[PDB]
Structure 1
């Protein structure tokens, strides 16, 4: 039926409805740190989130999205391997049922407890819908989460999850500062890829940060209390909403550090 992360509709089944699932630049991938190429040509990332305007948090069924006002250049990403300005539209996470899994990208086969994706679109295309149809339409900042000390800046997100437990539920979520979710260092790996959920379009320039952020066991535990289902339907806990690593094929992963 509809795609998901279950046994009968999981990632291994997606290709039937979305043939591009077996494409040439699919994500996520395993980042082999010894085969990655240091590129001195890469510029530092420029993250300008000081004027970010968050608007709402919504349970979209396969995850929850924190949406931002993208009608102006309020929260933008520039620099790095990017040409132009990319506006932040939403961020979401991928996590597991256990602390030993949950991330989509892996580093030398190592899996993290979760992965944060900050999605941005290239302003030269006018809107998000047009951007996803272009090879350089989106830029996604990926951040790994490891279990350890609590992340203060994440608690505001954690506390509102009870109000959007089921699919379709939304809640006002204003004045949230995404800067509180960033690690100290902005060193990164980058490669051309795709969205990791259907339609799996190959329109993404991935920027994966090397430094993970730490969150507490209690914080991630609350992520695991969400539901894939809508209210009234049989409860299905929202866990393991991650796609496994895909073949790198004819691609090179570049590093901004040596």
Structure 2
């Protein structure tokens, strides 16, 4: 069984014992130092085509909630940017804090956001997600920060169903959710090679982290915190602070698709 979680006894500092790649050379998340994450003019615009996305289900898996998609065809796909080929959307999930001052996995010049959205996509050349996660170019994860402010209409359908999946293992039908409602205006981004941010921590991810956050109301993020890590019939453990701290960049380069205000050129 899995021991790992986010507590003091089983959290990120313990993960390397079962998953020694936790101390690897390409671990995520990372701090994005915007001065050293240089503009790369060879980076193409991202193509996020979600108009035909087909959501299926929403699930509390004991460490986040996932919205799952039908990935049997090239409907919802990510391409362009740093990517070679076509990556199919399989699910999205969030990381959030116990309070509005923390929650994101990536940081920008050490700044944390209240939450972070991960849209997970796999490379169609590999046939399915399980095959893709075994390869360095297998996954592309689009990371989007959530900044507390005005309520986000694009998030409300998700928040409204969370009361039906309060405990680990619970799921609910969740059709016709349009993930276009979770995208900011700008598709400017940073990109680097990294890992899954939960066990098994495989170094199979091209990370694409958007510059522009999307909004979330304080009330909306509070509803994330009403979920529980525990299963039905166990003492309640609120699902909060389900984020891994930032990991050493080591020899990697973060590239920017745009000129940041910290770049003279």
Same structural fold, with TM-score higher than 0.5 when normalized by the shorter chain: yes
**Any idea what the Cα deviations from partners look like across 1:35-71, whole Å, max 9, x if unmatched?**
1110000000001101100000000000000000001
Looking at structure 1, the residues matched to 224 and 127 of structure 2 have their Cα atoms a distance apart, in angstroms, of 33
In the alignment, structure 1 segments of 5+ residues that lack a partner are none
Q: How does 1:112-127 map to 2 (within 5 A)?
A: 112-127=113-128
Per the normalisation by structure 2, the TM-score is: 0.97
Count of aligned residue pairs for this structure pair: 258
Deviation at 1:22, TM superposition (A): 0.1
- Residues of 2 paired with 1:216 and 1:36: CA distance? 30
Unaligned runs of 5+ in 2: 260-265
CA distance in 1, matches of 2:246, 2:177: 31
Give the secondary-structure state (helix, strand or coil) at the position aligned to 1:119. Answer: strand
Moved beyond 3 Å, runs of 4+:
none
Q: Distance in 2 between matches of 1:213 and 1:244?
A: 21
The aligned counterpart of 1:207 is: 208
Q: Quick one: distance in 1 between partners of 2:8 and 2:134?
A: 30
State how far apart, in whole Å, the 2-side matches of 1:36 and 1:77 are. 22
Q: Deviations over 1:18-42 (max 9, x none)?
A: 0000000000000000111100000
Tell me whether 1:20 sits opposite 2:21 in the alignment: yes
Which SS does the other structure have where 2:13 is aligned? coil
Question: 1:14 and 1:116 mapped to 2: Cα distance?
Answer: 22
Shift of 1:2: 0.8
Q: Supply the distance in 2 between the matched residues of 1:109 and 1:50 (Cα, whole angstroms).
A: 34
Q: SS of 2:120's equivalent?
A: strand
Q: Distance in 2 between matches of 1:94 and 1:141?
A: 13
In 2: Cα distance, 1:147 partner to 1:157 partner: 17
In the superposition, the TM-score normalised over structure 1's length comes to 1.00
Structure 2 residue matching 1:139: 3-state secondary structure: strand
Does the residue aligned with 1:158 lie in a helix, a strand or coil?
helix
User: In 2, distance between residues paired with 1:175 and 1:121?
Assistant: 21
